[PDB]
Structure formats: C-alpha cells, structure tokens
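Methods, example record. To illustrate the input and output format used throughout this study, we show the complete record for cAMP and cAMP-inhibited cGMP 3',5'-cyclic phosphodiesterase 10A. The sequence lines were provided to the predictor; the line carrying structure tokens was produced by it.
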Amino acid sequence: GLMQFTLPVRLCKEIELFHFDIGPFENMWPGIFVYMVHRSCGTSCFELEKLCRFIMSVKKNYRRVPYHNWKHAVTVAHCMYAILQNNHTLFTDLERKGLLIACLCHDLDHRGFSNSYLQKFDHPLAALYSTSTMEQHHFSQTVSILQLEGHNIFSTLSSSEYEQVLEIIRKAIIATDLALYFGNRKQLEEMYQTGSLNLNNQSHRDRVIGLMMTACDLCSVTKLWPVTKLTANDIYAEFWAEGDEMKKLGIQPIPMMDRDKKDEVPQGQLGFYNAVAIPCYTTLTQILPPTEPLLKACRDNLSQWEKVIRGEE
Ligand SMILES: Cc1ccc(C)c(C(=O)Nc2ccc3cc(-c4ccccc4)nn3c2)n1
Ligand SMILES: [Mg+2]
Ligand SMILES: [Zn+2]
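The corresponding predicted structure is encoded as:
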C-alpha cells in the first residue's frame, strides 16, 4: 500500500504529454502502465500482485507482429491516460479503471490482418463473428485472461459494478473497429452542433468514449514527426504482408496494401489525414477542449507529409 512507482525525471515529466513515446526498453512498459493506473485511478484501484500478473498474461497474448503488438497496446493506453488526466472531473471511478484496461487489451492476439482478409480467407473467427470480427475476439481474450486464477483485478467490485466495467470495456474495444468510427463521429458532430449532446445520457457517453478509443488507437499520427514517420514503416509492413496474402488468394489488393505501390504512400497518408485523422481529433477537441494538442500534432504531421510530396524531404 505504501509502495509507489516512480519514473526517471524525463519520463515523469514527458509521460503527462500527449506526444510521449514509451521508448525501446520493453522491460520498462509494465512500470509505465502501473504508474499511469496509480495517478489515473488511485494506488487502491487494484491489488498490485493481481495487476502485474494480469499485465504479464496480456503481454504474453500479444503476438510478434510489426505494428499490432505489445508496444501498440501500451502506446494506446498512454494516449487514454493523457486524455483522462487533462479531463479529471468528467469521468467516474469505474470508467478510468475500465478504459486503461480496455486500451491495453484492445488488440489482444492480433495476427496483423484486417477483418476483410479474415472474411476473404474464410477464417473460423469470421464464422463466429460476422462484424467487428477481430474486435469481438479481442474482448473474448480479455474476458479469458480476467478468468485465469489470480487475474481478477476487479475482485473488490460489487456484482453490478463488475458488469458495468466489463460493459464499458466491451463497447470500448468494439469501437476500435474503424468501420464503426465514421457514423459514430457524424452523430457526435450533429449532436454537438445542435447542442443535444448530453454527458448524463449514457448512450451519449458511449459515443464519446468510442471517439476517445478511435483517437487513442490512431495516436501514431499525433506524435512528433520522427516517431510518426518511423511508426508508418511498421503500419505498412503489416499492410503489405496482407496485400501479399490477398494475391495468394488470387485477389488484387487495394493500393494501401500493395508493396508494388510504395511510390504512392505520401499521397495515401494525405487522404487518411484528411478523411479520418483530422475529422477525428477535430470532433474530439469540440467535445473535450483540453485534447486540442492531439489536433495540433496531427495537423503538424499532415504538413510534414505535404512536404514529403513536394520533394522537400
Ligand atoms: C488505422 C491506421 C492508423 C494509422 C495510420 C497511419 C494508418 C494509415 O496509414 N492509413 C492509410 C489509409 C489509406 C491509405 C492509402 C495508402 C496508399 C499507399 C500507397 C499507395 C496508394 C495508397 N496508404 N494508406 C494508409 N492507419
Ligand atoms: Mg484493432
Ligand atoms: Zn489498435
């Protein structure tokens, strides 16, 4: 109970910032996550022994893929920590508990393939879950790990608190299905512009937590340029492997996934910033003003991609 976690001085300072990079020392990522739970939630939210055993089983169940790996899980959880710390009073005890766990678990047992590739391959997971195929798997893996002995980090919650927190974790993980994001933002945009948005409406909170999850999941586009640029290599390594696999099935992949079309990458980033990233962080800055730095960093990176096209790098 009197045991705290402390980071070195640079991490202690930089970790509060949206654009923090968790760095290349894997063995420090668990301490970073625990430190974020303790300041975000309390030193009393979880039994330290259970939380650590939970963190290590979650790590074990992320695969060695180029992008959708353990580092992504912790990066996405750090983005949520920054949003929660900059919006202290807006969220309940349970939501802060549930969302950091949801973020750490959101891509459990990912194989580096889109829902689309699962459907065209006829993967068994696509028979079991017709929509948000991987996202229903990820939630399923989360429940499994929570049911291992010594792993119930929610043991001290009531029956109905426990069910509320698993329902928050489920909606949060489903919402990382980017196919659901477009409608979700459109509805938040309309609700905010006609002043109907109400945070005591549970169906409204759900949508807002959905957008936060999208924003944390895409937070690669909100880092400083050198981090954003190097992360894009990992993202495309998965996309091009998926493209190769599409060709193996006898299907011409979309150009995003075709390694023969590396040349067109910079223009593809423009489209994604214009269609997805900027609208995401814009709508988020409108609903949650203190998240504005994410919008600013995304715009900076769009500007860096335009410079790449213009031969200026
Ligand atoms: C989910 C997520 C999170 C972060 C990023 C950064 C991306 C991401 O990079 N998304 C996208 C979207 C569309 C798109 C088209 C292209 C293209 C490439 C080469 C030739 C032609 C077209 N790349 N590309 C990339 N996606
Ligand atoms: Mg995912
Ligand atoms: Zn993700």
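Annotations derived from this record:
The chain has one domain: 28-310.
Residues 28-310 form a domain with the Catalytic domain of cyclic nucleotide phosphodiesterase 4b2b fold (CATH 1.10.1300.10).
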